[PDB]
Amino acid sequence: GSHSMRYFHTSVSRPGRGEPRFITVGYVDDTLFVRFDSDAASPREEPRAPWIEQEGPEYWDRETQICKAKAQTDREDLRTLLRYYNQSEAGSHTLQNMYGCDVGPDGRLLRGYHQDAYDGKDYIALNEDLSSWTAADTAAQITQRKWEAARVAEQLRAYLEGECVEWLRRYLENGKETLQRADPPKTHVTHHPISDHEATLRCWALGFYPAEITLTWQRDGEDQTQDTELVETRPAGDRTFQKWAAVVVPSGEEQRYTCHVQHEGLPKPLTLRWEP
């Protein structure tokens, strides 16, 4: 179906301990494919997926150059933001940036993104129109004025509508074995006695890709939204993801409870019950 490409960047200052650390990673959908870490002994952009390995030396040199350039601009920007927020040079601060594109099944641009945060808070974001900005505060308004003067949005839009989508399409074809395969969840329901009077029903989803999934418990057909413990979807470490949902149920009433599972890898949503 639809697909996305995203680049993430984090710079973290560390006064007294050298220059800020810079880490950037690239993803297609939920698959990591490139990384760069300023603290590596000889920092270069490195492949993290088999299908990107075929790109040539020109590709790797250019991507490395771009990451290093972003590290440098971030270092400059961290100094600038200390001024904008009247902050001392003593503390650690963080700049984050994400940008990228979503495409539909037919490969057309659905939406573009470019957004920045300072110290974990929204700073400035490109709007969905890819032509205007939303600034979170009067400091970010200064950046907005500068970026308007430099025609940043126009160049960004050109990238998002152009190379972003074209290279995403390229990666999807080259990596079609994995990028265009959904692995459905393996599901089971386990029962964990708590006391004489009640037990935990845990609905499991294992080994699935991509990460998007819905697990819900029903009692007599009513969603148990408020009484479900739903852990965050977590990486198994081998491309796939895991998740579980749990309900505490009065012993004897186990059959009034149903677990429902929706994943793009399933032709039909699943209905599970504790069986033992």
């Binding site: 680049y7 991507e63 990451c67 601009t73 600038t80 950046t143 500068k146 940043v152 960004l156 190379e163």
Partner: peptide, 10 residues
């Protein structure tokens, strides 16, 4: 494929 822009500062 990363976005290339020159001297983008905040």
């Amino acid at each position: 494929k990363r976005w290339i822009i020159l001297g983008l500062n905040k």
